[PDB]
Design a protein around this ligand. Sequence first.
Ligand SMILES: *[C@@H]1O[C@H](CO)[C@@H](O[C@@H]2O[C@H](CO)[C@@H](O[C@@H]3O[C@H](CO[C@H]4O[C@H](CO[C@H]5O[C@H](CO)[C@@H](O)[C@H](O)[C@@H]5O)[C@@H](O)[C@H](O[C@H]5O[C@H](CO)[C@@H](O)[C@H](O)[C@@H]5O)[C@@H]4O)[C@@H](O)[C@H](O[C@H]4O[C@H](CO)[C@@H](O)[C@H](O)[C@@H]4O[C@H]4O[C@H](CO)[C@@H](O)[C@H](O)[C@@H]4O[C@H]4O[C@H](CO)[C@@H](O)[C@H](O)[C@@H]4O)[C@@H]3O)[C@H](O)[C@H]2NC(C)=O)[C@H](O)[C@H]1NC(C)=O
Ligand SMILES: *[C@@H]1O[C@H](CO)[C@@H](O[C@@H]2O[C@H](CO)[C@@H](O[C@@H]3O[C@H](CO)[C@@H](O)[C@H](O[C@H]4O[C@H](CO)[C@@H](O)[C@H](O)[C@@H]4O[C@H]4O[C@H](CO)[C@@H](O)[C@H](O)[C@@H]4O)[C@@H]3O)[C@H](O)[C@H]2NC(C)=O)[C@H](O)[C@H]1NC(C)=O
Ligand SMILES: C[C@H]1O[C@H](O[C@H]2[C@H](O)[C@@H](O)[C@@H](O[C@H]3[C@H](O)[C@@H](O)[C@@H](O)O[C@@H]3CO)O[C@@H]2CO)[C@H](O)[C@@H](O)[C@@H]1N[C@H]1C[C@H](CO)[C@@H](O)[C@H](O)[C@H]1O
Ligand SMILES: *[C@H]1O[C@H](CO)[C@@H](O)[C@H](O)[C@@H]1O
Ligand SMILES: *[C@H]1O[C@H](CO)[C@@H](O)[C@H](O)[C@@H]1O
Ligand SMILES: *[C@H]1O[C@H](CO)[C@@H](O)[C@H](O)[C@@H]1O
Ligand SMILES: *[C@H]1O[C@H](CO)[C@@H](O)[C@H](O)[C@@H]1O
Ligand SMILES: *[C@H]1O[C@H](CO)[C@@H](O)[C@H](O)[C@@H]1O
Ligand SMILES: *[C@H]1O[C@H](CO)[C@@H](O)[C@H](O)[C@@H]1O
Ligand SMILES: *[C@H]1O[C@H](CO)[C@@H](O)[C@H](O)[C@@H]1O
Ligand SMILES: *[C@H]1O[C@H](CO)[C@@H](O)[C@H](O)[C@@H]1O
Ligand SMILES: *[C@H]1O[C@H](CO)[C@@H](O)[C@H](O)[C@@H]1O
Ligand SMILES: *[C@H]1O[C@H](CO)[C@@H](O)[C@H](O)[C@@H]1O
Length: 472
Amino acid sequence: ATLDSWLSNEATVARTAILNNIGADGAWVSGADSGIVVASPSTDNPDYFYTWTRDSGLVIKTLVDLFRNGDTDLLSTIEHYISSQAIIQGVSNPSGDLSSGGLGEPKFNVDETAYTGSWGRPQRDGPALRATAMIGFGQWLLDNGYTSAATEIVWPLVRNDLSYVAQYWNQTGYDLWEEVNGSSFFTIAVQHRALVEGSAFATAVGSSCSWCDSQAPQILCYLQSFWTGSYILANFDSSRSGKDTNTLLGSIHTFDPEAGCDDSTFQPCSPRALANHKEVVDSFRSIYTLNDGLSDSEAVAVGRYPEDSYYNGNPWFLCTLAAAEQLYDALYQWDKQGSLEITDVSLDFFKALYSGAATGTYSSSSSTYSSIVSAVKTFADGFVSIVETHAASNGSLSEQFDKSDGDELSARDLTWSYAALLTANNRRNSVVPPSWGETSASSVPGTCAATSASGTYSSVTVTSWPSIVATG
Ligand SMILES: *[C@@H]1O[C@H](CO)[C@@H](O[C@@H]2O[C@H](CO)[C@@H](O[C@@H]3O[C@H](CO[C@H]4O[C@H](CO[C@H]5O[C@H](CO)[C@@H](O)[C@H](O)[C@@H]5O)[C@@H](O)[C@H](O[C@H]5O[C@H](CO)[C@@H](O)[C@H](O)[C@@H]5O)[C@@H]4O)[C@@H](O)[C@H](O[C@H]4O[C@H](CO)[C@@H](O)[C@H](O)[C@@H]4O[C@H]4O[C@H](CO)[C@@H](O)[C@H](O)[C@@H]4O[C@H]4O[C@H](CO)[C@@H](O)[C@H](O)[C@@H]4O)[C@@H]3O)[C@H](O)[C@H]2NC(C)=O)[C@H](O)[C@H]1NC(C)=O
Ligand SMILES: *[C@@H]1O[C@H](CO)[C@@H](O[C@@H]2O[C@H](CO)[C@@H](O[C@@H]3O[C@H](CO)[C@@H](O)[C@H](O[C@H]4O[C@H](CO)[C@@H](O)[C@H](O)[C@@H]4O[C@H]4O[C@H](CO)[C@@H](O)[C@H](O)[C@@H]4O)[C@@H]3O)[C@H](O)[C@H]2NC(C)=O)[C@H](O)[C@H]1NC(C)=O
Ligand SMILES: C[C@H]1O[C@H](O[C@H]2[C@H](O)[C@@H](O)[C@@H](O[C@H]3[C@H](O)[C@@H](O)[C@@H](O)O[C@@H]3CO)O[C@@H]2CO)[C@H](O)[C@@H](O)[C@@H]1N[C@H]1C[C@H](CO)[C@@H](O)[C@H](O)[C@H]1O
Ligand SMILES: *[C@H]1O[C@H](CO)[C@@H](O)[C@H](O)[C@@H]1O
Ligand SMILES: *[C@H]1O[C@H](CO)[C@@H](O)[C@H](O)[C@@H]1O
Ligand SMILES: *[C@H]1O[C@H](CO)[C@@H](O)[C@H](O)[C@@H]1O
Ligand SMILES: *[C@H]1O[C@H](CO)[C@@H](O)[C@H](O)[C@@H]1O
Ligand SMILES: *[C@H]1O[C@H](CO)[C@@H](O)[C@H](O)[C@@H]1O
Ligand SMILES: *[C@H]1O[C@H](CO)[C@@H](O)[C@H](O)[C@@H]1O
Ligand SMILES: *[C@H]1O[C@H](CO)[C@@H](O)[C@H](O)[C@@H]1O
Ligand SMILES: *[C@H]1O[C@H](CO)[C@@H](O)[C@H](O)[C@@H]1O
Ligand SMILES: *[C@H]1O[C@H](CO)[C@@H](O)[C@H](O)[C@@H]1O
Ligand SMILES: *[C@H]1O[C@H](CO)[C@@H](O)[C@H](O)[C@@H]1O
């Protein structure tokens, strides 16, 4: 259809736009140092001309996955990013130094200097996201015979971030939206993932991560507290409803293609994540004029949380895309398992799309399965069509689009918007990321403990990169 063709062209635009926003040769961000991912080229109203640890880590993980799938030209970009982080980790900033909390700093200036003004800090998701981005590249290096680069450059950088996560996971901080000082779902979810794949990577390079091992099960134990019985609470210490796309992002960014529909890790197809999907998406149905007249079986424009007032509270391209991505992931999981189960917890999600839905197990050859997957795919594509409808004529994607008229607003050419388009398109095409080991990390301890483990910190100096030749 036109969505299919639009997506193919948009994937090309998205890749180009991301590169334009990375220093020091990116066309839109002159001034940014080598390997520095800039959030948006907007220098004023709003000023997003900074580098955030979260946006950078999410964008680089996307590029690493494209690279591993054959986009070999991205090699230099990834190397520059890793080199830049060896420096950033050691930059003294308002959150502290390398070994005293500095790794939790949310953003830095594009020239690698500290941002010293007031900001919601620290944001503890950053080190976890950066670790996940680097581990993926480290895995490729190991697999392709560049052991020294993996052991001497990547591992030591990752070791710093993993130590930060194990030491401070059980402390409050700001959420991914940089507004709530408390304990956040997305953050705890990505931290659990990071420690698990961090331990595997440490073993692979001939080292160890005892703090990853002792803390991962405890983070998972705590993660269970976020389930309210009807949806996933986005944050503790908040007065809001708790319905927030923060939870959809937590699910899609911790999606493991080898995982079943596991409730303990909130996988995309788990009953808990499906129930949550409907609760979150439904919260935007009556608050945006853009959604007027749409039925419960139709996709709608999705924002961050219903109480949002940032730029008056509007839908976000990356949030609308996350709503579609969780469903593409679920379709993949059901297909791989050869069945789909409907439980009392997820019944409402299914009933809204297929009125004949009833609890039970449906094999992939059954009529019910066929009806449900068709309806889910159409629903998911619906979210992507809304994005297509409001993207600029040349493919530009801003941070937000107007709740009433759909015009683009806030930061223009937002790097994260482009990465979210790339991942949603990939999942739609059944292109999935490497597994992180969820199948051996979904067991919940019988008793949760408020605890931590201190790892180790050491400054890394990147002398040089071996002449890596990527072909495939
Ligand atoms: C698809 O097509 C679109 C349309 O062409 C493409 O988007 C355009 O892309 C160009 C870049 O190629 C952007 O140019 C920059 O513009 C800003 C100014 O932007 C503001 O003003 C614009 C014009 O307003 C006037 O005209 C319009 C239309 O007639 C009218 O509506 C308005 O009322 C007014 O009369 C606005 O259009 C623009 O709006 C957009 O952005 C908003 C905020 O993000 C957003 O909310 C809106 O929805 C809208 O999207 C906005 O209000 C210039 O400041 C900027 O200039 C810098 O960069 C150029 C090089 O690109 C350089 O020559 C300049 O010297 C300057 O350099 C500084 O900034 C750079 C980073 O941006 C940095 O690298 C430099 O080192 C330097 O930085 C230093 O100085 C700054 C000083 O503040 C400091 O902060 C730094 O720290 C540092 O010291 C560009 O000229 C267009 O804005 C943009 N247009 C739109 C509509 O988005 C799109 O890219 C295409 N997509 C694809 C995939 O191809
Ligand atoms: C450090 O780790 C320890 C160990 O894991 C953490 O301790 C656990 O903390 C959770 C969260 O506080 C706690 O769960 C609460 O248990 C209470 C009963 O024992 C519940 O009454 C409480 O209810 C809230 O959460 C429900 C979902 O579980 C919601 O349905 C309900 O509406 C409540 O949420 C509202 O109220 C809270 C107030 O707590 C508010 O913050 C929310 O925004 C919302 O308005 C919880 O279920 C566990 O009992 C604790 N476990 C142990 C062993 O002590 C500790 O929190 C961690 N600290 C940090 C900073 O990470
Ligand atoms: C770029 C972010 O801009 C906003 O965040 C600022 C906000 O404007 C400030 O007012 C202040 O917010 C404080 C509240 O005023 C106060 O009531 C209480 O909530 O504490 C907060 C924090 O001190 O600081 C924050 C920054 O911490 C906006 O609200 C954020 O959502 C914006 N973040 C987005 C952009 C960024 C880069 O692309 C993304 O990483 C992030 O996920 C986005 O949400
Ligand atoms: C998640 O991982 C646990 C082990 O930690 C398994 O028991 C479970 O079945 C799922 O694979
Ligand atoms: C599954 O595994 C976890 C550790 O990963 C245990 O804590 C739990 O008790 C169960 O054996
Ligand atoms: C947190 O608590 C655990 C036990 O609950 C310890 O093993 C750890 O050293 C830290 O004190
Ligand atoms: C993490 O925090 C615990 C306290 O909960 C300490 O015991 C540990 O040494 C580390 O600092
Ligand atoms: C936690 O504690 C260890 C020692 O117990 C330190 O090496 C680490 O830097 C952090 O302070
Ligand atoms: C923690 O452990 C690392 C790795 O052994 C040391 O290099 C560091 O100095 C600290 O003692
Ligand atoms: C801690 O570890 C780093 C990484 O190997 C070294 O660069 C530093 O000198 C210290 O031994
Ligand atoms: C590790 O940290 C030191 C400062 O302690 C820096 O000089 C180095 O560049 C790296 O960031
Ligand atoms: C990397 O190594 C250099 C020395 O070669 C240190 O100065 C730096 O702090 C980091 O340990
Ligand atoms: C690259 O190699 C030099 C060799 O002298 C080290 O000093 C530096 O710390 C980095 O590992």
